[PDB]
Amino acid sequence: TSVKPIFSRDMNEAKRRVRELYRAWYREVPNTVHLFQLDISVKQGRDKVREMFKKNAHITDPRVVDLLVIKGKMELEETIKVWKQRTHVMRFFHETEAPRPKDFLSKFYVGHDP
Amino acid sequence: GVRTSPTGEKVTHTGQVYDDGDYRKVRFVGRQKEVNENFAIDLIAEQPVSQVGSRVISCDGGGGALGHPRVYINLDKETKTGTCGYCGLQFRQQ
Amino acid sequence: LKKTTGLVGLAVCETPHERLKILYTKILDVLGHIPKNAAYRKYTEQITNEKLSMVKAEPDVKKLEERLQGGQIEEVILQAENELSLARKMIQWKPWEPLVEEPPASQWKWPI
Amino acid sequence: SNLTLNFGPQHPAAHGVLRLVMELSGEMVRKCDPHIGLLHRGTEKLIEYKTYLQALPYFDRLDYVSMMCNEQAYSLAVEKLLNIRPPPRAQWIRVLFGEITRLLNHIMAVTTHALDIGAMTPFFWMFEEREKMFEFYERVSGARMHAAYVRPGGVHQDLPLGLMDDIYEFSKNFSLRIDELEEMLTNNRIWRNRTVDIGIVTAEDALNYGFSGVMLRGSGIQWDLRKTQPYDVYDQVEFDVPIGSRGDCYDRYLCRVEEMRQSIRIISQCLNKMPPGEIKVDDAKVSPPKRAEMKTSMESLIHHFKLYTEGYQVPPGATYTAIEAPKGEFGVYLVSDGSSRPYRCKIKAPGFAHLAGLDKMSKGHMLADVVAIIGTQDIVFGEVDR
Amino acid sequence: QLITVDEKLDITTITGVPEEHIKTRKARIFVPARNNMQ
Amino acid sequence: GEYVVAKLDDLINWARRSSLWPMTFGLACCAVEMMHMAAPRYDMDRFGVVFRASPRQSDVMIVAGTLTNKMAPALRKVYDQMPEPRYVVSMGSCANGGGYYHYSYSVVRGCDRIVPVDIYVPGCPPTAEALLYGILQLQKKIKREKRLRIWYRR
Amino acid sequence: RPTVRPRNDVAHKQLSAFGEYVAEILPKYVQQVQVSCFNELEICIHPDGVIPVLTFLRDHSNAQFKSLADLTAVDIPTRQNRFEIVYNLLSLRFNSRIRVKTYTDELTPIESSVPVYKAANWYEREIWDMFGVFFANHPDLRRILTDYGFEGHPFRKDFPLSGYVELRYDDEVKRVVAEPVELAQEFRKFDLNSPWEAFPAYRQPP
Amino acid sequence: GSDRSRFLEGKRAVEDKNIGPLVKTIMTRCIQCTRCIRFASEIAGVDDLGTTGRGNDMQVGTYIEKMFMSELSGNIIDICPVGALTSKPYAFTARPWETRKTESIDVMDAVGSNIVVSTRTGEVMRILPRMHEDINEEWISDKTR
Amino acid sequence: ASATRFIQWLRNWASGRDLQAKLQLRYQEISKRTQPPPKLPVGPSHKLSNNYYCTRDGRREAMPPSIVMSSQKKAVSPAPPIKRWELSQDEPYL
Amino acid sequence: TYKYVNLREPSMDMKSVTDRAAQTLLWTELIRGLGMTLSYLFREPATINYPFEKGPLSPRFRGEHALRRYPSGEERCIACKLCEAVCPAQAITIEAEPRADGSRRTTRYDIDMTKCIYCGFCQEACPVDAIVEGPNFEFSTETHEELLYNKEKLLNNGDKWEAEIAANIQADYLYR
Amino acid sequence: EDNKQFFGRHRWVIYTTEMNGKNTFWDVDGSMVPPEWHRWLHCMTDDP
Amino acid sequence: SKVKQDMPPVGGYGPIDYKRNLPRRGLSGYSMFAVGIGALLFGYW
Ligand code: SF4
Ligand code: SF4
Ligand code: SF4
Ligand code: SF4
Ligand code: SF4
Ligand SMILES: [K+]
Ligand SMILES: [Zn+2]
């Protein structure tokens, strides 16, 4: 279980890098909404940012957290440098995808997928 | 042997035809259903059986290397013709 | 003297024999700080001493070049410079030491 | 400030679309950031679901100006893992069409290089010659561009009767066509003003940045894989390697024009030295038998059936095989797991490393010198992106 | 300098596979049966 | 009224089809055969199809090559900036329906998912003559248009 | 024999001797040395040896592998370290090629070789992009081939051929949108492997 | 084998035998391995298949017009190495490389014979035995098949 | 080829070359578009005897790599130093 | 063997210097280029009068696909699925069953012409010369759906073009 | 035909003004050539 | 029948040029300037 680290040597070191990423993402949303002229609100954009961080809250492996932070920083740069077009920033919201049935009965009616 | 179904749609040599209740025939409205009218099953049955004087005959479909792989056909049965499995020509021992 | 080495960015050398003597001597000095049994020292010392001996005997630059089989004498000077840089790095790395770690059982098996 | 060069010229051009993010100060280029991937099509992953024959056409569509040269590289890699040898007539045909392809590429490289700089007339003169060479491609293969003609084992079909005489007729007049091209560009003060001392690269920097081909030889490096590491019958033909002295766009332009003359010189020897015999390895477990055999012989039919369904199996192993493609060293790292489909196929595109050097080569140049520098590297984003 | 991780190796979050094609899928691990034709 | 509208469509249809200024996306291989159509053997300019144009002066967009997901937004934006009337010619298997990369994770399976297409030119690549046939097929399509006849009957 | 590729015995001896030479000088990192029957020399090294081994081969007077011809990765999911990093180098002085291989897994970083070969800069970005292998101390490590925001590493063996999402233009939102992939015709998987062994010389033990 | 032929004569051709609606016979393909005869006699306990004639003209069959109708008869399709014996219902519908194989269980009786369901483009094409030494070995019944 | 004698002189003089000897348009020198049928030769393995495939099977002579060292003297170079290129005697300087 | 493309030293004698000065001031090398474009103006153009004239092709040309027949009219295709197996683009879809006369024939034979790479591998793989790429290349359509050929379309292409397909095969089959 | 013309211009067709009930006086296209002549017009053969 | 294959003619094909050929044209720089000045002087007179 002795492994080469990426950046952080333990979870407390990793959590620090995570929080800096959240600050950077949190502060960029108002600019992102304006530069790309998005039709979402700043609150909507920040809610998505929280949603994306939230669904990785269970991770307890510092190496995995470093990769998650590394990937998250690359996404921020693409947005900050305006390499992403309007289409790319809006793919987090899936506006054209109809809601997917979640309960048993709804999925039973539509098809065979669980 | 092209023919039409009750709805007036031509039946293909594969037997395909949209049934009465099938919406998919709307694709032909204002257009046409592509159907080839030289049915191979009917054309190959017009060929005359060939009379040969041996138990075994070979067929390459004609044309030598422009035909099909050369196969040998046994003609011992006198109750039926020997048919080529590549081109459908028929042979009978005389 | 030549007019050009023929290689863009590579300048002619006015004193090739003296420059080579400095570089090979510096290499042998650096090789003295490597453990005697390290293969790098034994092999690097051998080739350096062969090249240095050739530089001592041959005064004509053209004739020396056919002896060294290393291209233009400026290319040979450049290579000596890289060897000297390499020898310094090997002192930190110390590659003569035992293998750091074995690979997993089937790391280098092909086909799987 | 910050700019972005357009995807492509307003006139019709065939080399792909680039997104070039530029930093400028005044007229000067401070940084070039090439954003590629706009033609990345996942070729290397697709090849893993194809048999070794099914993957061959993917190589026509990489450097889709040097079609048969890309085929030859893949064929040499597969023939090396198979441990077989293509027959001598096939090798001569492959060198003959390798040099015809080099002409095709260099015409595209040089005249579109002038066309982008604004010298547009030579483009029209020289694609009438390319049109006639497309006819040679179509006469041996039935396709003007993506021939799928060179294959592991040799070539698909033999030259039609009368093809060699027509190739001779074309080669007879071609040097004059190169002469007219040089009349427009070589001594033209405007052309020289656009190319001389533009994009200078030192010999050592060229090697460390992974350059190859003319990008090396323009800086005086004496390297040509046809000479140093010969393949097929390149060791039986006589030609000279053009070498530059100043490492700039103008010296690389002269190298390409001289390489065209040497290709004509090599083609002349292939036409005179073409030997008789078969065109694919007489080994029906690799190369499919003749159609007349397939229709008469039981063994031939079985081998035809298996070669065109499962394909031939390649012994397990990995090779890196490279050729002197018209754009530089074109190689393939081909991994076999013993089956009839490649396990991994990495493609080394010469333009991949060259475009990675654009930032270096453009330092301290004007915005319009970047046009010339991408021109002198001769980039096709089919091979850069795969 | 090596570090220690006592956890179970998991990469579900860094592979980019959509969630439903992780949790709802069933993988079968087997040695394929011989094709009984041959 | 009826007579004038018929002759008036005849005029504008003649003008628009006799002066087809193209914007070519030289995306990949097919752009090479596209260049051969501009080369002296076929000389597309002799039909009124000029050599260079500019997106904002173009009448027809020729999608000549593979369209990847990364390139899709930029191609749609160029189509959106073209002034009308504008036509799209899909050239080759890749642009037609994905072609040899149809099953790739990074390729749009036909440019008709991104823009409306007027003519599909088959081939991999279509020969320069095949593309010229498709361009002259688009002229016939424009010759069939009836903008004023329809407008007059509204 | 006319159909059989001839053997070159002199290059096999030469590359073997040089393989022992490199193994003797770099024992700290070299784990295996082998030469193929078509005479390609491969050095298999511990991943910690990337920079020392590549620097030695570039700068040493008897090596002079100045040109990095290619740098790629191979995914072998059955291995604990699924990724194999392959360096193909060229020596113009000695007219020879060498292949240097190492390994890593999904979470273990490899040292960037940009200091040894500037050519490696884009190759490592492509390996990161397409396999998800991180290179430590890279000047600018980011995606190079895939679309912005693309999730996953397509060249991994377990990434589906057609991916997970596909693009189209949607009139309602007036932009290109990404949706879960649906195929009008599914790709038809073929089982082509014959059930009879082809090459006894490679038989694995029972 | 070798990769080519040196046989310069004409080939043998034999007449086909009708042995029921399940097993199609193209006996020109037979290579006289006698697997069907041995299987029929030992495994199925039916002594209806043999060899008649001699030498190059030795033929496998029943001699008389007989049907080989046994609850295990369809297994001679599997053990015939060549296309001499083939599934009549399956004829001409698919090739083996294009079929997807699903390893499943038979439910036509209570033996639980292990099977492979061959599918192609969403359709069931045929049923094959799956080897299980403790249940069906490598056979299935004609109802299962 | 149809150009008048004056125009031939005019474009010859302007270009500086004799363009008429090397016309870039093709006339009758091309090959006829109908050719006699070929009779292609066969390869060296088209023998009736002494041709066992095990004596000419390239794939089966491939071997797994030789393992020089596995973890489980004079200095050498990977090959002799490359010989210097000689300047062209055809046209050393362009 | 190598040569130098640009390793000339200009002569610095006053005559040569004055020659270069005249070139600079009088633009002589620019006048020379104008002569070359002038010489082309009086050359015959290479343009051909399409569609009244056509580019030359060979019998090997790989164009639009067609399904062929025997002289009796029976289909050559026997549903062996070798073309479907070799197709690099998976552009062919085949289904088959015993015909009413017991013949081994296809019920579905589709070629997605927008997947096809026009590589000709199917006609090489075919053992009976059933599927071929014909000489037609002027078949562009106005809709995507018109490029999804089914067996009826391909059989009609064979009946339409057989007169020329047979001649092309006759001219090239000895090279195959 | 005019063999004095350079290759590619030495053969040509003047299309009919009516084909299959269509007015082709102005509307001609290359698909109107039947297969027997298609081979000759594209120089796949020498014999009409 | 004798094998018939696309081969070069007996004795091989004739010579093929490839070397650069830019013919030398024009007057010396002295002659060009002398003509230019002569034209000026005539115009001035
Ligand atoms: S359709 Fe064919 S020629 Fe055109 S870009 Fe795609 S692969 Fe290349
Ligand atoms: S099992 Fe098949 S090959 Fe063997 S004897 Fe019976 S029919 Fe013939
Ligand atoms: S598939 Fe097998 S049994 Fe059938 S004909 Fe071919 S070799 Fe004979
Ligand atoms: S030409 Fe090639 S891609 Fe097209 S259907 Fe035939 S085999 Fe498939
Ligand atoms: S077209 Fe030919 S290869 Fe394809 S299924 Fe029919 S007979 Fe077989
Ligand atoms: K069987
Ligand atoms: Zn037959």
The DSSP line for D179-240 is: HHHHHHHTT-HHHHHHHTTSS---HHHHHHTT--THHHHTTT----HHHHS--TTGGGS---
The CA-atom distances, in angstroms, between H70 and each of B32, D112, H22, H141 are: 51, 76, 10, 9
What subunits touch chain K, counting only 3 or more CB pairs under 8 A? F, I, J
CB within 8 Å of C42: residues ≥ 6 apart: C36
Residues in chain I: 94
Contact between L3 and D158 (Cβ < 8 Å): no
Distance J155 CA to ligand 5 centre (A): 13
Positive or negative, the Cα torsion across J18, J19, J24, J27?
positive
Q: State residue F61 phi and psi, 5-degree precision.
A: -105, 125
- Which ligand 3 atom is the nearest neighbour of the CA of D301? 6
Residue D131: closest CA among L26, H10, J56, G7: J56
Q: What is the DSSP letter of B48?
A: P
Compute the distance between CA of residue L8 and CA of residue L16 in angstroms, rounded to an integer: 14
Q: C-alpha angle J1/J2/J3, rounded to 5°? A: 140
Burial track D101-139 (b if 16+ CB lie within 10 A, e otherwise)? bbbbbbbbbbbbbbbbbebebbbbbbbbbbbbbbbbbbb
Contact between I78 and G98 (Cβ < 8 Å): yes
Compute the distance between CA of residue F123 and CA of residue F37 in angstroms, rounded to an integer: 15
Per DSSP bridges, beta strands H50-52 and H23-25 are: unpaired
Residue with tokens 């700039």: D248
Q: Would you call H78 and E36 a contact, using CB atoms and an 8 Å cutoff?
A: yes
The CA-atom distances, in angstroms, between C73 and each of C4, C62, C67, D247, J165 are: 12, 8, 11, 20, 67
- J119 CB under 6 A from ligand 4? yes
Compute the distance between CA of residue D71 and CA of residue D59 in angstroms, rounded to an integer: 6
Compute the distance between CA of residue D377 and CA of residue D252 in angstroms, rounded to an integer: 9
CB within 8 Å of A87: residues ≥ 6 apart: F73, G175, G176, G177
Distance H81 CA to ligand 6 centre (A): 5
Residues of F near K (Cβ–Cβ under 8 Å) read 41, 129, 133, 136-137, 140, 143
3-state secondary structure J61-129: CCCCEEECECCCCCECCCCCCHHHHHCCCCCEEEEEEECCCCCEEEEEEEEECCCCCCCCHHHHHCCCC
Compute the distance between CA of residue D282 and CA of residue J115 in angstroms, rounded to an integer: 33
Contact between C31 and C48 (Cβ < 8 Å): yes
Residues of F near A (Cβ–Cβ under 8 Å) read 73-74
Residue I33: closest CA among L39, D135, D247, L27: D135
* Residue G99 three-state SS: strand
Q: Which tokens go with G163?
A: 């991916």
Residues in chain H: 145
Q: What is the DSSP letter of H42?
A: I
The CA-atom distances, in angstroms, between D150 and each of C22, D57, D123, G129, I13 are: 54, 10, 28, 32, 44
Starting from the CA of residue D54, give the closest ligand: 4
Annotated ligand binding at F30? The verdict is: yes
Closest residue on chain J to I83 (Cα): J1
CB within 8 Å of G176: residues ≥ 6 apart: A87, F72, F73, F76, F114, G167, G168, G169, G170
For D230, other C-beta atoms within 10 Å of its C-beta total: 16
* Residue C73 three-state SS: helix
* CB pairs < 8 Å spanning D and I: 83
Distance D47 CA to ligand 5 centre (A): 24
The H-or-E segment that residue D336 falls in is: strand D328-336
Contact G82/E at CB under 8 A = no
Distance J130 CA to ligand 3 centre (A): 20
Please name the member of D129, D176, D317 whose beta carbon is closest to the beta carbon of I22.
D176
Please name the member of D41, D128, D134 whose beta carbon is closest to the beta carbon of F40.
D128
Please name the member of J2, J32, J42 whose beta carbon is closest to the beta carbon of I87.
J2
- H83 CB under 6 A from ligand 3? yes
* Residue L30 three-state SS: helix
* Residue J41 three-state SS: helix
For E37, other C-beta atoms within 10 Å of its C-beta total: 12
Positive or negative, the Cα torsion across D158, D164, D165, D171?
positive
Q: Which tokens go with B30?
A: 């204002």
Longest dimension (CA), chain F: 55
Contact D291/B at CB under 8 A = yes
Positive or negative, the Cα torsion across K15, K20, K22, K23?
positive
Annotated ligand binding at H40? The verdict is: no
Task: Give the closest-approach CA distance of H9 to chain I in angstroms.
Answer: 14
Q: Which tokens go with G104?
A: 């890593």
Residue J119: closest CA among D383, D62, D143, D288: D143
Closest residue on chain E to H115 (Cα): E33
Contact between J133 and J106 (Cβ < 8 Å): no
* Residue A53 three-state SS: helix
Q: C-alpha angle B84/B90/B91, rounded to 5°? A: 105
Per CB-CB distance under 8 Å, the chain F contacts of K31 are 133
Compute the distance between CA of residue D170 and CA of residue D131 in angstroms, rounded to an integer: 11
Counting Cα atoms < 13 Å in the Cβ hemisphere of C16 gives 25
Contact between J162 and J117 (Cβ < 8 Å): no
Contact between J164 and J172 (Cβ < 8 Å): no
Question: Which residues are bridge partners to H60 per DSSP?
Answer: H51
The CA-atom distances, in angstroms, between J36 and each of D88, D122, D127, J30 are: 43, 10, 17, 10
- J122 CB under 6 A from ligand 4? yes
Residue with tokens 């109809």: A98
CB within 8 Å of D380: residues ≥ 6 apart: D15, D16, D62, D63, D64, D65, D327, D351
Contact between C25 and C18 (Cβ < 8 Å): no
CA dihedral angle for residue K17, residue K19, residue K21, residue K27, rounded to 10 degrees: -60
Counting Cα atoms < 13 Å in the Cβ hemisphere of G40 gives 23
Per CB-CB distance under 8 Å, the chain E contacts of H130 are 33, 36
Residues of C near G (Cβ–Cβ under 8 Å) read 38-40, 43-44, 47-48, 51, 70-71, 79-80, 82-83, 85-86, 89-90, 93-104, 106-108, 111-112
What subunits touch chain A, counting only 3 or more CB pairs under 8 A? E, F, G
Task: Give the closest-approach CA distance of G170 to chain A in angstroms.
Answer: 8
CB within 8 Å of F14: residues ≥ 6 apart: F143
In single-letter form, the type of residue at position G136 comes to: A
Compute the distance between CA of residue D46 and CA of residue J90 in angstroms, rounded to an integer: 12
CB within 8 Å of J55: residues ≥ 6 apart: F41, F127, F128, F129, J48, K8, K42
**Helical H runs in chain C?**
16-31, 39-57, 61-68, 73-93
Compute the distance between CA of residue J30 and CA of residue J34 in angstroms, rounded to an integer: 7
The H-or-E segment that residue I12 falls in is: helix I5-15
CB within 8 Å of A45: residues ≥ 6 apart: A29, A32, A33, A38
> Which amino acid residue places its CA nearest to atom 2 of ligand 5?
J126
Q: Would you call D245 and C8 a contact, using CB atoms and an 8 Å cutoff?
A: yes
- H41 CB under 6 A from ligand 2? no
Q: Would you call G31 and C112 a contact, using CB atoms and an 8 Å cutoff?
A: no
Q: State residue D322 phi and psi, 5-degree precision.
A: -135, 150
Distance D298 CA to ligand 5 centre (A): 18
Q: Would you call L17 and D175 a contact, using CB atoms and an 8 Å cutoff?
A: yes
- Which ligand 5 atom is the nearest neighbour of the CA of J79? 5
Q: State residue G43 phi and psi, 5-degree precision.
A: -110, 120
Compute the distance between CA of residue H121 and CA of residue H123 in angstroms, rounded to an integer: 6
- J81 CB under 6 A from ligand 5? yes
Q: Would you call A113 and E24 a contact, using CB atoms and an 8 Å cutoff?
A: yes
Contact between D366 and D32 (Cβ < 8 Å): no
- J128 CB under 6 A from ligand 5? yes
Q: Would you call G195 and E35 a contact, using CB atoms and an 8 Å cutoff?
A: yes
For H49, other C-beta atoms within 10 Å of its C-beta total: 22
Compute the distance between CA of residue D24 and CA of residue D228 in angstroms, rounded to an integer: 42
Contact between D378 and D113 (Cβ < 8 Å): yes
Q: What is the DSSP letter of D331?
A: E
Q: Which tokens go with D165?
A: 């005489």
CA dihedral angle for residue G58, residue G63, residue G69, residue G71, rounded to 10 degrees: -60
Distance H27 CA to ligand 3 centre (A): 12
Contact D166/I at CB under 8 A = yes
Residue J133: closest CA among J91, J81, J79: J91
Contact H30/B at CB under 8 A = no
Q: Would you call C108 and G31 a contact, using CB atoms and an 8 Å cutoff?
A: yes
Compute the distance between CA of residue F92 and CA of residue F130 in angstroms, rounded to an integer: 10
Compute the distance between CA of residue A50 and CA of residue A58 in angstroms, rounded to an integer: 14
Per CB-CB distance under 8 Å, the chain F contacts of A86 are 73
- F98 CB under 6 A from ligand 1? no
CB within 8 Å of G132: residues ≥ 6 apart: E14, E15, G106, G152, G153, G156
> Which amino acid residue places its CA nearest to atom 3 of ligand 5?
J126
CA dihedral angle for residue D336, residue D337, residue D340, residue D346, rounded to 10 degrees: -40
Please name the member of I3, I89, I91 whose beta carbon is closest to the beta carbon of J44.
I3
Distance D64 CA to ligand 1 centre (A): 9
Q: State residue D360 phi and psi, 5-degree precision.
A: -65, -50
Annotated ligand binding at D69? The verdict is: no
CB within 8 Å of H129: residues ≥ 6 apart: E36, H75, H78, H113, H114, H115, H116, H136, H138, H139, H140
CB within 8 Å of E23: residues ≥ 6 apart: none
Resolution (A): 2.5
- Beta strand spans in chain G (E): 30-35, 41-45, 67-75, 83-91, 96-104, 110-111, 135-136, 165-170, 175-180
Residue with tokens 């998800």: G132
Q: Would you call G164 and E17 a contact, using CB atoms and an 8 Å cutoff?
A: yes
